[PDB]
Design a protein around this ligand. Structure first.
Ligand code: NA
Length: 129
């Protein structure tokens, strides 16, 4: 599914991401925009052979099992295909584990490079939340 901005904002808010570990909702929406373009089905392969899955482009080396990433931890205890669902529950629950991991949202390279230190409130402006 390709989310609309406000639609995703509302879903992320419902799943407890607004202010999760101190990151306002706008951060999460920004990160989803530049990671996946709001498309739950986005995949992208890395040079290391791992792949990133879903709206938040969660990586198969650490976080999910895709059956093809040797010596990967599956710290979210999920098949990586669960991350591509139109229901973002799994992506959100895994993202909460990642963000808790000690590097915060810097784990998301597009967040660091395109959202961090910008006016991220702009990503939820106009939305009914
Ligand atoms: Na893995």
């Amino acid at each position: 599914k390709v989310f609309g901005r406000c639609e995703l904002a509302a879903a992320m808010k419902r799943h407890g991401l607004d202010n999760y570990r101190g990151y306002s909702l706008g951060n999460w929406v920004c990160a989803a925009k530049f990671e996946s373009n709001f498309n739950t089905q986005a995949t992208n392969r890395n040079t290391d052979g791992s792949t990133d899955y879903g709206i938040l482009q969660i990586n198969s080396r650490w976080w999910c099992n895709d059956g093809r990433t040797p010596g990967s931890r599956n710290l979210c205890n999920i098949p990586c295909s669960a991350l591509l669902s139109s229901d973002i529950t799994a992506s959100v629950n895994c993202a909460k584990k990642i963000v808790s991991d000690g590097n915060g949202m810097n784990a998301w390279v597009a967040w660091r490079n395109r959202c961090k230190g910008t006016d991220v409130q702009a990503w939820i402006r106009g939305c009914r939340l």
